[PDB]
């Protein structure tokens, strides 16, 4: 039953990015590191995180920032391992195969960048920067983390920024 999956998915919360009352994206924290896409600009909803100094990634199109120690407990847990199957995402479950994550066509658009992908246990596997519809499914320009502790950004051909 998908209802329980949706209920588990809708448990945790993220911090959106605002620009003049418009939500251009989301800014999540995982493992004590603040993340938000660089191409998406705005002000983070929470003032404290918005006050943090951040640095830019030229080829990765996102910013990073260390959360304060007194708040690092309240962070999402990551997973370098990505078993084959379907994963929970805010809009809906994500069916992924061949190392690339796919969503039903017509799901996800601008302002949905940066929303993390959760596993069955709630650990974040990867975050999405954009996606392109290529037929019945829509491949997503997600950035994943490798087992060794590295960062990987699988971007499909001529993908669309969100």
């Amino acid at each position: 039953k998908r209802q329980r999956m949706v209920m588990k998915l809708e448990s945790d919360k993220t911090f959106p990015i605002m620009l003049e009352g418009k939500i251009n994206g989301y800014a999540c924290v995982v493992g004590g590191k603040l993340f938000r896409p660089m191409h998406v600009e705005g002000k983070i909803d929470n003032d404290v995180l918005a006050a943090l100094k951040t640095k830019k990634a030229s080829k990765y199109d996102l910013e990073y920032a260390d959360v304060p120690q007194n708040m690092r407990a309240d962070t999402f847990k990551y997973t370098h391992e990505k078993p084959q199957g379907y994963y929970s995402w805010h809009h809906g479950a994500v069916q992924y195969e061949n190392g690339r994550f796919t969503v039903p066509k017509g799901v996800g658009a601008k302002g949905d960048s940066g929303r993390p992908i959760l596993d069955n246990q709630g650990r974040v596997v990867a975050i999405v920067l954009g996606g392109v519809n290529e037929g019945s499914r829509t491949a997503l320009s997600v950035v994943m983390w490798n087992e060794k502790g590295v960062t990987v950004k699988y971007t499909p051909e001529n993908c669309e920024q969100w």
């Binding site: 004590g32 590191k33 990634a57 030229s58 990551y78 960062t151």
Partner: protein
């Protein structure tokens, strides 16, 4: 004067390329909850631990 200009341009390009090297070394490894690796800091020292 031309030799001095050539040397200065070479040094500036070396600085640009070394900044690119630091970015290319760290950015794949910065974007992680760990973001610290003893071996890379030993072999290239891309990020200055004392500087913040």
């Amino acid at each position: 004067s031309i030799c001095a200009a050539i040397a200065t341009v070479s040094v500036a390009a070396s600085t640009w390329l070394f900044c690119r090297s630091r970015v290319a070394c760290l950015t794949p490894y910065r974007l992680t909850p760990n973001a610290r690796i003893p071996f890379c800091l030993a072999v290239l020292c891309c990020a200055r631990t004392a500087r913040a």
